A = this chain, B = another copy of it.
Amino acid sequence: PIVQNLQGQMVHQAISPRTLNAWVKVVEEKAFSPEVIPMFSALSEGATPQDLNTMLNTVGGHQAAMQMLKETINEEAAEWDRLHPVHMREPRGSDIAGTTSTLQEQIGWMTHNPPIPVGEIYKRWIILGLNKIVRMYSPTSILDIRQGPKEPFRDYVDRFYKTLRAEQASQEVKNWMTETLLVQNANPDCKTILKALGPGATLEEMMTACQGV
């Protein structure tokens, strides 16, 4: 992170040891279940690119996942260099990625007016790679999720949304999936309740109708 020093000038604060341990727990124990993206996004709040690379040094070891992450970062760095050609110096994609930039360059950019938020930029490329990894480690297609013959509708909704949260689908597809597939893949008793609501039903109406089904 970045902290105002005793002289009032902004200075680096290293990402604290037990924060990195909380990220190591998230990488090692949750096996890229979709909550890894929220927890990465949270633990890296205000992280400089040096801090973000300090976190990715423990995605290393998951060498298949790390490869997908590195190539996604490189792909986005090239796309940055394409969208923003050459005119502190303005950061190139490798400067955003914290490989070629100095720490003082990173903090300078993040503390500029207007800010050049290279940390919270690079964090988007990393989150996009983590989305690819969460897809790879997903156990099921959304089309495989069906309600158990005695499964509570809440628990099926959780299985469904947890899977949907991993999918590649655009929001327009996720809307269609929510309405059609959540109804379609319910068990026949609960499906009968859901069908009676008609196509415009909110998830609130669906679940409140199916309490104790």
Q: Which A positions have Cβ atoms within 8 angstroms of B?
A: 1, 6, 14-29, 31, 35, 37-39, 41-47, 54, 57-58, 61-64, 68, 132, 135-141, 143-144, 152, 154, 158, 161, 165, 169-170, 172-174, 176, 178, 180-181, 184, 192-193, 195-198, 202-205, 207-209, 211-213
Contacts and interface: CB of A to CB of B under 8 A. Distances in A.
Contact of A181 (B42, B143, B204, B211): B143
Contacts of A25: 39
Contacts of A170: 172, 176
Given A18-B19, A20-B45, 9 more contacts: A27-B38, A62-B161, A139-B154, A169-B176, A192-B212, A193-B196, A195-B208, A195-B211, A196-B196
A37 to B, nearest CB: 8
B22 A18 contact: yes
Given A143-B180, A165-B61, A196-B197, A23 B35 contact: no
A64 B192 contact: no
A21 B42 contact: yes
B198 A209 contact: yes
Greatest chain B CB density within 10 A among A31, A38, A202, A208 is at A38
B42 A23 contact: yes
A61 B38 contact: yes
Contacts of A132: 204
Contact of A43 (B21, B28, B135, B181): B21
Contacts of A208: 135-136, 195, 198
Given A17-B44, A204-B64, A141 B184 contact: yes
Contact of A140 (B35, B47, B211): B211
